[PDB]
Amino acid sequence: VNFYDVAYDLENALRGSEEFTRLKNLYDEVNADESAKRMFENFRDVQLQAQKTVALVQQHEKISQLMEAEQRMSMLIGELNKIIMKPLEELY
Amino acid sequence: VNFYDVAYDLENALRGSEEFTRLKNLYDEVNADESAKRMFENFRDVQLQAQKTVALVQQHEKISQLMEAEQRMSMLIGELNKIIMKPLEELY
Ligand SMILES: [Ca+2]
Ligand SMILES: [Ca+2]
């Protein structure tokens, strides 16, 4: 099959996953909370005193849950990459 | 559908692609050439005077073709990632 055809099926799988729904719900929940929205945004912005700002946000339970869901999404993408890149690892 | 189910279909798509076959053929061709194998290996090894070693290998046509095929494979993985991560970009 075509690599791009499958990639679009994989995008759909991600779009439809409970994991994406959970991340989206946390993201919306944080944005609906005026205090949390501001803290999360100032955190995001400071990443382009750091370290920081990370302490500010980690002390907030709901924002921490969102950040944890972000890191788990990053881990998932990492897993997908390890899966699909196996033939390259075999080669080298 | 399940994200992992599709990821394994995508691994199969990559395994079966002419692009993978081309990379593998170049890799094997370089390794079958005693002089080129040594240059490519010393290059790979120097990456963990650099810059370098990169000049050594780029002056060899066949090794350069392999390195170009590597970079195009990296670009392909990049494209797949951009595709599947679109729902995340929409969210943020
Ligand atoms: Ca917690
Ligand atoms: Ca050339």
From Swiss-Prot, chains A, B:
It holds the Pfam family Com_YlbF. It comes from the Bacteria. HAMAP family: UPF0342. Belongs to the UPF0342 family. This is UPF0342 protein YheA. It comes from Bacillus subtilis (strain 168).
